[PDB]
Amino acid sequence: GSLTEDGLSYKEKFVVRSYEVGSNKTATVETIANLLQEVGCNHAQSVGFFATTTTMRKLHLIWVTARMHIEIYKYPAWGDVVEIETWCQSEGRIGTRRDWILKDSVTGEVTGRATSKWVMMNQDTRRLQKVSDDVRDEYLVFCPQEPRLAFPEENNRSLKKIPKLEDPAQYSMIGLKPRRADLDMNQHVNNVTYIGWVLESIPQEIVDTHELQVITLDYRRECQQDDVVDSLTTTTSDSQFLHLLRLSGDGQEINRGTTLWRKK
Amino acid sequence: GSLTEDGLSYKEKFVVRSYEVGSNKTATVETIANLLQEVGCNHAQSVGFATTTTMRKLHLIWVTARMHIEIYKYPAWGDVVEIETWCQSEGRIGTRRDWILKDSVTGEVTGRATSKWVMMNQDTRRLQKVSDDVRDEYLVFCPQEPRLAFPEENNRSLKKIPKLEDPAQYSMIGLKPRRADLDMNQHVNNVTYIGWVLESIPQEIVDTHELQVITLDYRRECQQDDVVDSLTTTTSNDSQFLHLLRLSGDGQEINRGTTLWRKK
Numbered sequence: 001g002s003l004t005e006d007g008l009s010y011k012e013k014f015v016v017r018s019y020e021v022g023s024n025k026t027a028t029v030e031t032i033a034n035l036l037q038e039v040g041c042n043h044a045q046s047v048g049f050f051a052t053t054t055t056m057r058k059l060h061l062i063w064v065t066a067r068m069h070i071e072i073y074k075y076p077a078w079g080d081v082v083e084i085e086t087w088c089q090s091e092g093r094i095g096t097r098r099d100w101i102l103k104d105s106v107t108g109e110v111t112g113r114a115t116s117k118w119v120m121m122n123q124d125t126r127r128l129q130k131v132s133d134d135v136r137d138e139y140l141v142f143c144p145q146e147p148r149l150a151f152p153e154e155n156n157r158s159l160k161k162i163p164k165l166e167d168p169a170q171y172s173m174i175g176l177k178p179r180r181a182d183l184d185m186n187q188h189v190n191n192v193t194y195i196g197w198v199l200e201s202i203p204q205e206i207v208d209t210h211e212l213q214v215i216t217l218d219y220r221r222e223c224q225q226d227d228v229v230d231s232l233t234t235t236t237s238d239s240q241f242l243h244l245l246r247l248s249g250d251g252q253e254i255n256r257g258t259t260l261w262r263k264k
Numbered sequence: 265g266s267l268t269e270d271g272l273s274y275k276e277k278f279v280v281r282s283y284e285v286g287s288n289k290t291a292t293v294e295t296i297a298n299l300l301q302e303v304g305c306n307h308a309q310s311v312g313f314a315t316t317t318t319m320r321k322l323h324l325i326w327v328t329a330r331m332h333i334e335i336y337k338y339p340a341w342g343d344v345v346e347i348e349t350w351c352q353s354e355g356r357i358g359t360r361r362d363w364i365l366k367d368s369v370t371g372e373v374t375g376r377a378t379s380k381w382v383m384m385n386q387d388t389r390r391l392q393k394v395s396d397d398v399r400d401e402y403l404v405f406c407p408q409e410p411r412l413a414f415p416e417e418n419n420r421s422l423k424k425i426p427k428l429e430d431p432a433q434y435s436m437i438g439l440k441p442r443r444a445d446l447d448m449n450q451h452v453n454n455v456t457y458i459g460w461v462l463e464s465i466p467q468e469i470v471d472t473h474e475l476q477v478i479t480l481d482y483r484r485e486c487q488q489d490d491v492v493d494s495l496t497t498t499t500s501n502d503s504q505f506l507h508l509l510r511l512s513g514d515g516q517e518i519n520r521g522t523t524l525w526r527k528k
């Protein structure tokens with residue numbers, strides 16, 4: 001992988017692996033999400049970087065995902081080369097946004113796009129906060145100054161408010177627990193695991209006859225290593241679904257989301 | 265990746281990804297096992313394939329009976345690991361796939377693995393010896409003189425594994441596969457069983473030791489709607505364990521294995 005000519009974005013090529021594909025012999029949305037995370041990590045490493053600035057480490061501040069939005073037009077087949085370009089943009093004091101463009105390496109056509117919102121949090125107390133002047137100054141030199149959006153369209157799917165699923169849910173998958181492969185190097189549950197858990201409550205018949213086109217996921221709270229999750233889904237309609245992940249016992253919300261599926 | 269000069273083995277280089285590492289910032293044994301499977305798939309594709317012409321006609325497949333992996337050094341995040349793989353016929357019993365892992369920079373062997381595969385009818389699940397017609401079709405892709413990753417006289421790769429007796433010292437109850445655990449054929453990936461074995465190892469061992477050796481027997485599959493119990497008993501500065509995976513209800517065995525851990 002490499003930073004582009006202007007040093008304001010990063011590109012990387014990936015060959016889709018045999019274990020990364022589903023029953024359609026194309027990459028799962030979880031493989032795509034893992035690759036987006038990997039190209040995001042290589043971008044931070046290439047520019048001097050958890051990927052925190054000098055002041056953030058001193059104050060015990062980290063970047064945490066508030067929302068992930070992914071739209072796939074074509075899932076790459078096993079053996080195909082996919083190229084991903086990623087960049088960051090400051091959204092003032094609210095936080096930052098990381099965006100991605102996925103392309104077929106052979107045709108150069110855009111096969112997908114993603115956008116994510118990140119907020120600053122104290123890693124010990126878990127308290128959110130606006131981004132400081134000094135912290136902003138440290139990372140602004142790595143972001144394009146004019147807006148560059150993967151989802152430019154006014155009133156698009158990436159910024160829509162998501163409601164809370166009401167009981168009873170139409171479908172459910174209960175007792176989901178993370179295993180050691182679900183944890184990252186910091187012993188926290190990988191953000192991609194939550195996408196898998198959302199997808200667990202989609203009926204098999206939808207998975208078999210439809211392809212996932214859009215997934216928007218809000219992150220409210222973490223699932224700890226010893227927590228148990230219930231995944232809930234209700235059809236709101238192409239097929240559209242409303243999703244809710246909550247802790248198995250008290251019913252404490254961890255995530256909410258929506259999916260849009262297209263008939264094959 | 266590429267077949268070597270003589271066309272009897274295959275080599276591939278892999279850069280270790282951010283999500284592929286554990287708490288030590290080096291590749292998990294499940295990442296290693298996934299890579300072994302990937303280089304095995306690319307080898308079969310490069311030589312014309314994962315069944316021969318006669319196998320497809322008779323509805324016969326290759327299934328893993330045993331996997332044995334020994335790691336001397338786990339590659340760090342960002343490191344390049346090179347893996348060489350080859351197959352050998354073991355007469356009518358079946359075949360063996362072997363692997364050598366090396367650090368690309370030093371050329372030092374950092375790991376090795378060996379696996380035994382048997383022929384099974386896809387539909388009835390009945391095993392069978394390898395016929396001459398099938399043998400003739402794949403023998404041209406194997407070295408004729410023996411080439412063993414584990415040449416040693418009384419090495420760990422061929423030791424008989426006993427059945428863990430109740431009560432187990434440790435256990436992890438109610439493990440269930442999710443859609444990311446399935447391969448393109450909708451069967452549970454062989455690497456998931458390694459993860460489930462490791463689930464019953466106490467955290468203190470994972471935190472202070474490194475896994476050196478894992479030997480795993482495969483007896484029966486876990487189906488998409490099955491629930492598994494992972495059982496471990498210490499059999500021993502090195503720690504050794506006896507492992508058993510069984511179906512949560514009737515206690516039907518699916519796997520048995522052993523692990524050897526060395527203090528960090």
Ligand SMILES: NC(=O)c1cccc(Cl)c1
Binds near residue numbers: 047051088
């Ligand atoms: N991790 C960061 O602070 C950050 C901010 C902007 C661009 C990049 Cl590459 C990284």
Ligand SMILES: NC(=O)c1cccc(Cl)c1
Binds near residue numbers: 313314406
């Ligand atoms: N899949 C096979 O039958 C096989 C047998 C020997 C070598 C290789 Cl590369 C493949």
